[PDB]
């Protein structure tokens, strides 16, 4: 059928709509307040102890950077995906730990200090070595350089907007823990309102529910990737002789990954017309890993009460 770009096209204003900028600022505010409320339940003594003994952090880095990209590459080779799909899944595999993993570990209620230390060190190591690993794994895909397209401003801004609320929470708990109730209650109400706003606004901002036109095996691999990440983290931590409380957080940190940098690199490399449903692929991958995490939460809460 020759080779032609997809009929998928996007509105011209989509680049600089006021709605997109509003969505971006609301998401940044949401992440800031999530991280504030989630650092309000931490302490610096335990994070210092965890960084002193990097066993959990080391296993997290190994599970996210040595084995996850390799299995993403093997999945791309075995499933016989195209060039764009293979590059997309590879970039998703090589991405650092997402900030959603902190909330999910809080749901699993395990070792928040260790989770935050591994996620910040994983973002730092992403900035350090995503280019070289993406380069060695992209032989036969994207003959172009690809080293200068990964975001570096985005990574440092994400690190800063994650560290600032955590630092504020640490300092506030250590110095004067007397406005926990009011601040956390206001945070919860504003986060619920913000989530409602994001859910309503994205419905009209995204549109074009033609995402099912994505080929089924790409959905299959975007389904298997979060689950294989979760299983890999859990098995690697368990068979490495670590306690139960400190292993669920490692597993669910390795399973959860950032995906906005995949969107940035794909949109810099290719036009929205060459990219078909892979433009909305990262959004599908994120919500699917969210659903898988919720299923794991249900399993954990069915095992806890019994």
């Amino acid at each position, epitope marked *: 059928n*020759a*080779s*032609a*770009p997809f009929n998928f096209t996007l509105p011209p204003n989509f680049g600089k709509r006021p709605t997109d900028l509003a969505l971006s600022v609301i998401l940044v505010f949401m992440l800031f307040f999530i991280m504030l409320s989630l650092g309000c339940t931490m302490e610096f003594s335990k994070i210092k102890a965890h960084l002193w003994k990097p066993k959990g952090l080391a296993i997290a880095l190994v599970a996210q950077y040595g084995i996850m990209p390799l299995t993403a590459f093997v999945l*791309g*080779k075995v499933f*016989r*995906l*195209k*060039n*764009i799909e*293979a*590059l997309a899944i590879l970039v998703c595999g090589c991405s650092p730990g997402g900030n959603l993993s902190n909330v999910f570990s809080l749901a699993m209620k395990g070792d928040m200090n260790l989770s935050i230390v591994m996620t910040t060190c994983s973002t730092f190591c992403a900035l350090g070595m995503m280019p070289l690993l993406l380069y060695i794994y992209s032989r*036969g*895909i*994207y*003959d*172009g*350089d690809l080293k200068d397209k990964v975001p570096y401003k985005g990574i440092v801004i994400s690190l800063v907007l994650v560290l600032i609320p955590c630092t504020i929470g640490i300092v506030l708990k250590s110095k004067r823990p007397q406005y926990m109730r009011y601040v956390i209650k206001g945070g919860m109400i504003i986060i619920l309102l913000c989530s409602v706003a994001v859910t309503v606004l994205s419905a009209i901002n995204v549109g074009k529910s033609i995402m099912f036109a994505m080929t089924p095996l790409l959905i299959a691999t975007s389904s298997l990737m979060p689950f294989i990440g979760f299983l890999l983290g859990y098995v690697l931590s368990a068979l490495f002789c670590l306690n139960g409380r400190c292993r669920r957080t490692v597993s669910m940190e390795t399973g959860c990954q950032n995906v906005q940098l995949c969107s940035t690199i794909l949109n*810099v*490399a*290719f*036009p929205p*017309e*060459v990219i078909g449903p892979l433009f909305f692929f990262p959004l599908l991958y994120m919500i699917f890993q969210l659903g898988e995490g919720l299923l794991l939460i249900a399993i954990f809460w069915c095992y806890e009460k019994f």
Partner: antibody
Amino acid sequence: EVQLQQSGPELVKPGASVKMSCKASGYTFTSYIIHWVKQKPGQGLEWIGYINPYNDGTKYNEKFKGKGTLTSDKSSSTAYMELSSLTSEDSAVYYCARSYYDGIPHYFDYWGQGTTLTVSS
Amino acid sequence: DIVMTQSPSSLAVSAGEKVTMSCKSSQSLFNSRTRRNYLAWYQQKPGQSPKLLIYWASTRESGVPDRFTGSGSGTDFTLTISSVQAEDLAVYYCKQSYYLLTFGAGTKLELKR
């Protein structure tokens, strides 16, 4: 349908500084890449390089790395080529070819009529 | 790199003779992930720009006669014309694009006397 319009014949001194343009108006200009092929008289085709008009990223042949310099203009929907270093041996026929490019350029489905360039005194 | 070598480079076909052109490439230009086998055959009648005939070494471009069929895999490829008609006099190149774009030497056609 689509048709790629070349610039026209060029006659320059051995002092170089010549530029060639390839205008293409049949499609969405940023979806495909534009190649450049050099053909000496009776010596077969020879690849020079291509330009991706979306991100302005270029790839060149090892031999033509020093000389060729490919630029693209989204507004005017044309792709350029500058040599800037010419000798008597350089005169040939230059074509611009359009290929679809997902991760690897696929094939040259459409070609231009060609620019016959002559270098002499 | 890959250097593409066309075997005949000159032959004469009169009315219905086969052509069985062949260019053997250098290494395996067959993508394992996508079973596509990157290759393309262009026909350049004298005084004209080259025209695409075969893409992916097996599929013919819409607009060519049914006479031009391309068959091959791995490194050995073949192009056959079957009933060579009068206007089939050109040069065929069998470019490859697996790693880096390279064209073949070219095969010329004449008529027997």
